[PDB]
């Protein structure tokens with residue numbers, strides 16, 4: 335009665351939440367999505383016919399990043415409305431708190447793919463408001479279940495701050511975050527801050543760290559608090575750590591998986 339299972343690419347994936355596909359589409363056992371254009375279909379046979387006809391082999395919009403077989407496309411919601419709406423309905427299957435599916439023109443979407451000989455296969459995305467009055471540098475972020483916890487979420491979060499840096503601005507994801515979202519951001523912030531604390535020594539203030547990472551002072555402070563690296567003095571949070579403690583944190587299992595990194599040389603983008 336609601337959509338509870340999709341087929342996309344070679345994956346069958348169970349829904350986590352209600353998404354408002356038209357009612358007729360929920361009635362079916364599965365919903366079938368073209369992995370390239372994201373068209374959603376009611377039957378295995380309309381899906382297979384679509385597969386033979388559809389000419390898309392990657393997302394629309396501009397490939398603003400490409401390194402080996404990892405690519406990001408920037409897709410403006412005003413120029414590719416139907417694709418973006420299809421993407422938001424797909425995302426809402428895995429996001430409890432997303433509430434915007436149809437009004438996509440105020441958003442830009444950054445679609446992460448992993449490419450082979452067949453084409454560019456969707457892994458996840460984040461959306462971002464063109465004009466965020468609240469300084470949010472991500473609106474929603476979603477990694478499809480079979481790619482979660484495999485470094486792709488980490489890549490997109492780094493990606494979003496690489497945009498913020500090029501805009502000379504600080505940014506923070508729109509709240510509330512999903513459970514995995516919060517763990518992923520906290521662990522991303524800690525990694526980046528620790529590595530900067532190692533690489534200087536160094537009279538880095540919290541403001542310094544904010545300017546260098548585009549992470550907000552508040553997100554820096556709450557992260558340094560959970561690491562016990564901040565003291566408080568007459569109303570001001572102040573960095574308090576030894577080189578040894580920094581390396582103890584960095585040697586931990588948390589930071590041991592080799593990351594897929596964002597190579598700023600491969601990013602093609604200037605603020606609009």
Ligand SMILES: O=C(NNS(=O)(=O)c1ccccc1)c1cc(-c2ccccc2)ccc1F
Pocket residue numbers: 428429475476477478479481482483484485486487488489491512514515517518519521522
């Ligand atoms: O897959 C994710 N994190 N695991 S990760 O291996 O990329 C990682 C992220 C940050 C630091 C280390 C590893 C992830 C997943 C989501 C997500 C959130 C809600 C629904 C579906 C996916 C959002 C951000 C994420 F980073």
Ligand SMILES: [Zn+2]
Pocket residue numbers: 368369370371372373384388389390
């Ligand atoms: Zn298609």
